[PDB]
Amino acid sequence: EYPSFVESVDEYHFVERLLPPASIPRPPKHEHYPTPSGWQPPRDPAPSLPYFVRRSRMHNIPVYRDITHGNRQMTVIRKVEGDIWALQKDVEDFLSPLLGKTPVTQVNEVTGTLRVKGYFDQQLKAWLLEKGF
Amino acid sequence: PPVLRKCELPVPAHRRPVQAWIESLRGYEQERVGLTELHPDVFSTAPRLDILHQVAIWQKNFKRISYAKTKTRAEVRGGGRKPWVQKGSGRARHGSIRSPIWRGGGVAHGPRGPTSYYYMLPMKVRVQGLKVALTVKLAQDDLHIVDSLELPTADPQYLIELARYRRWGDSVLLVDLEHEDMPQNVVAATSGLKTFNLVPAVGLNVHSMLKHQTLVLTLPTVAFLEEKLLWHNSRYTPLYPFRLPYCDFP
Amino acid sequence: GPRALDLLRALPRVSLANLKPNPGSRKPERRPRGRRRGRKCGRGHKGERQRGTRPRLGFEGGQTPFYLRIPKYGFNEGHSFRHQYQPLSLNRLQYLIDLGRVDPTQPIDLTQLVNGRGVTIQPSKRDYGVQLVEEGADTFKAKVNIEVQMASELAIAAIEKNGGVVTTAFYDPRSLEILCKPVPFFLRGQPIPKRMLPPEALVPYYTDAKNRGYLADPARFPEARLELARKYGYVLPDITKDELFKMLSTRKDPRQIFFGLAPGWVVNMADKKILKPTDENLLKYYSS
Amino acid sequence: YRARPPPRRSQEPRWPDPDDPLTPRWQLSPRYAAKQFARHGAASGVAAGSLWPSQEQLRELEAEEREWYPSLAAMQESLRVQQLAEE
Amino acid sequence: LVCPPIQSRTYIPPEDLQSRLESHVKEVFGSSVPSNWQDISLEDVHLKFSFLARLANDLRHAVPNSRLHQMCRVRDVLDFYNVPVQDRSKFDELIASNLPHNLKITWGY
Amino acid sequence: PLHKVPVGLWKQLRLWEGIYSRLPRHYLRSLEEARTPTPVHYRPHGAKFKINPKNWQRERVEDVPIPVHYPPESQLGLWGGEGWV
Amino acid sequence: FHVRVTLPPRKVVDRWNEKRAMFGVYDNIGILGNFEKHPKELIKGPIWLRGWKGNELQRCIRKKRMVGNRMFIDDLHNLNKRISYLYKHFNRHGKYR
Ligand SMILES: [Mg+2]
Ligand SMILES: [Mg+2]
Ligand SMILES: [Mg+2]
Ligand SMILES: [Mg+2]
Ligand SMILES: [Mg+2]
Ligand SMILES: [Mg+2]
Ligand SMILES: [Mg+2]
Ligand SMILES: [Mg+2]
Ligand SMILES: [Mg+2]
Ligand SMILES: [Mg+2]
Ligand SMILES: [Mg+2]
Ligand SMILES: [Mg+2]
Ligand SMILES: [Mg+2]
Ligand SMILES: [Mg+2]
DSSP, X not given: OOOOEEEESGGGGGGGGGSOOSBXXXXXXXXXXXXXXXXXXXXXXXXXXXXXXXXXXXXXXXXXXXXXXXXXXEXXXXXXXXXXXXXXXXXXXXXXXXXXXXXXXXXXXXXXXXXXXXXOHHHHHHHHHHHTO | OOEEEOOOSOOOTTSOOEEEEEEOSSOSSOOOOEEEEEOHHHHSSOOOHHHHHHHHXXXXXXXXXXXXXXXXXXXXXXXOSOSSOSSSSOSXXXXXXXXXXXXXXXXXXXXXXOEEOOOOOXXXXXXXXXXXXXXXXXXXXXEEEESTTOOSOOOHHHHHHHHHHHTOOSOEEEEXXXXXXXXXXXXXHHHTOSSEEEEEGGGOOHHHHHHSSEEEEEHHHHHHHHHHHHTGGGBOOOXXXXXXXXXXXX | XXXXXXXXXXXXXXXXXXXXXXXXXXXXXXXXXXXXXOSSTTSOSTTTTTTTOOOOSSOOSSSOOHHHXXXXXXXXXXXXXXXXXXXXXXXXXXXXXXXXXXXXXSOOOHHHHHHTTSOOOOGGGTEEEEEEEOTTOTTOOOOOEEEESEEOHHHHHHHHHHTOEEEEOOOOHHHHHHHHOHHHHHHHTOOOOOOOOXXXXXXXXXXXXXXXXXXXXXXXXXXXXXXXXXXXXXXXXXXXXXXXXXXXXXXOOTTOOSSSOOTTOEEETTTTEEEEEOOHHHHHHHHO | OBOOOOOXXXXXXXXXXXXXXXXXXXXXXXXXXXXXXXXXXXTTTOOGGGSSOOHHHHHHHHHHHHHHSOXXXXXXXXXXXXXXXXX | OOXXXXXXXXXXXXXXXXXXXXXXXXXXXXXXXXXXXGGOBXXXXXXXXXXXXXXXXXXXXXXXXXXXXXXXBHHHHHHHHTSOBOOOOHHHHHHHTTOOTTOOOOOOO | OOOSSOGGGHHHHHHHSGGGGXXXXXXXXXXXXXXXXXXXXXXOOSOSEEEOTTTXXXXXXXXXXXXXXXXXXXXXXXXXXXXXX | OOOOSSOOOOOXXXXXXXXXXXXXXXXXXTTTSSSSOOGXXXXXXXXXXXXXXXXXXXXXXXXXXXXTTSSOHHHHHHHHHHHHHHHHHHHHOOSOO
């Protein structure tokens, strides 16, 4: 008592839209930057500085904020390749006028991480965008 | 005829591919047959010895199941009654004669049944461990790229002489692309050797890479490893396990 | 760059004999052995604490407990039946469009958002889909055919300003799971079911043109759009004479879950084929 | 030495013996056959007409839908009556 | 299939290293010599492989796999070949480093 | 160690093996089938779904038969399917 | 505290036998194999402990649920008593509460 059925292939092209991608697509090229969402691609040539802050897998700056014990506020700069000591020097020189004193920093050379004491995530993101990373 | 291998995946503009020699397993003296380029994000990442230790410990431990079990005081045969009355006897008070204090009594805590020490490291951590193992193997001059993994004879002594002539080391691990495609000559040569171990591409791991002093890779194996390891750097999280169909993944 | 690689040349071979975890990664365990950690082993003197017979957490030693002297009031009453809607900011939607996660050239659906990882829907946790919020309406500069379950009035105004289409539809939990994860449903081997109608509590929401309901009268859509444009002081774009008018006006049947596909079809992905029922009773059931 | 052959997941359909009393019931339920057809289709050997509900199953489904899913017109009428009563 | 004797891997840079480098650069590139022949890049993979292989065959010393990415120019190759390589260990160096009269070391292996 | 076959299937395996396998097929299937007896001491409910009066939600509801003890003297008469509760 | 007076036979353990040479060779079968098989499937042991980890109470509960229908009489009784004791101890005894 099996009902009769029709086997067709024409409508199968709709199933292609329902398959999610396993990889992250490269961002589309825009005629004007920055994009309305504020995203901005890195410069075509790499800067001559002796360090490189590699972009995230979602094409964003690896600058984050961290909280510990509920009151310890920190900023984490990740994906740093090169002279992380030079990067720390540049960051402290950039942040000294803002705070009136040398910011407290910790350098993880085996990992390639800079850890500044306090929330300077947006300021560091803007600084890295201006510097071209 | 030189054999030249170029990277098949987009290399970041700020990093240059690392060059390596391509040897051959046919002749003793012919140690420079071609040149290959390897992605910096696989063979030239930063050496994370902590990640290597994490991956090695995970490999040693997740498969472990300890079949150790000792009987507690509730599982020893007898000890169902008080050996003597609580008062008047003049000796210490006891309940079951199978208490941990007694001679034939049960174990207080001991090991309890088969214990599974199973945990699964995050996938990106495991991939980074593989990358770091390959990178340190290349950096310490213990990685050698060959082509097609072919041998003239099926004599293990031939491999022994070749290794001691090229100063590869006491232990060599040869990796081929596919299990069924390994040539019979090298298969028979390595079937009779202990320190010369031959594994397929899918059988590469940090534990064996560290166990064996020298790693030998073919060009298809290098390309396969490069493609498999560089996929996780620009991938989404799995909505469902990747064995299921995806738009761009098998 | 990586000077550690050059440093490793002088160092001896990296093997299993010289491996060390990161300092501070593994805090060493401490056992009740020795002079300091013995002699009651951190348990105290007599009482219930040293013998491990303490009361439960809420107990206060016979006093009426704090968690029991407070009167019962409905706070989580009926929590497992309240409708939940994951918010999606216009700012986040613009970010996804700019980064290429979702293509504005095609009708944006819940499946497309899930594939682009912009939202995460857990139907078992009583989520009923995605709602649109206006948190980024000032800088929204995209023309999309959005398809959500709830939409804010300001978000609708912002989208119509750029010239998109906002449609609010209802999805029962089964169809919502199917939309969120279509590939597992296609591997499940079951025919596509019909889309259940919204309950009486949500029928007024989805049958009004002010909310752009999918069951609303299409004749009242232009009136609502004009009222919105007059309220927010922008000219209503000439959507009809747009190049992508077909993509902007594409719609799902109220009993339809996917685009193009119909209830009762079986998607055999192994052979890349579609099986359609032909029985009169089956067709009537699936189209009713 | 030479490594053992790698563990590979076979792609051919699997059918447990229905005569074995020790086989689990979840491997004999119709959902298993439907999932096998979805995974393979041609190689599974399952008649595609069994996926759709039979006559009795369709009757039960229609009865359940009629009892627990009111029509749009009826629901709108009930809503109108409720608003009229509240007003 | 006879095993050749294993080389000692002891490298001493000869006096004619510059002339050998110039001759090999000519024999590899096959074009007109520029004013600064030491600043030519080794970007071309075929030319770099041929030059390195010829140098290894000539000097019985090949560049290690880790230093191939470092070898970018003929100047870098000259810097690599200007430094000697010693195969003897610390004990072997100490034995031949003119031990004093009251220091006796005997190998026990 | 563990039994290969769970204890629940021991009776079925004993019926499958031996002289029990030589019994007629219709008899074997008549004993194998297990029809639910009609409700006698408990009142069944009609619908499979019911609206919870306190929750005002539709919930699945099923029938749980009440265990009835049949004394040995019930086999010598016709009690109508009822016994001792 | 009396200790033995003779040298024990020195165990000639080799590090290059088959098991030690191929230890965990396919630990990356998934990652390097276009995922079909988890590293769970390479674990050999009791049915209720393949790709799972828990404390004693959870292990006993899982064993009773999975292979409890095939245990012997005394083994099942001991498992039930151990489950009861572990439940009481974990839910009613301790310091940190
Ligand atoms: Mg944190
Ligand atoms: Mg006892
Ligand atoms: Mg007693
Ligand atoms: Mg007692
Ligand atoms: Mg005894
Ligand atoms: Mg004992
Ligand atoms: Mg402590
Ligand atoms: Mg402890
Ligand atoms: Mg103490
Ligand atoms: Mg004491
Ligand atoms: Mg006291
Ligand atoms: Mg005391
Ligand atoms: Mg009182
Ligand atoms: Mg959620």
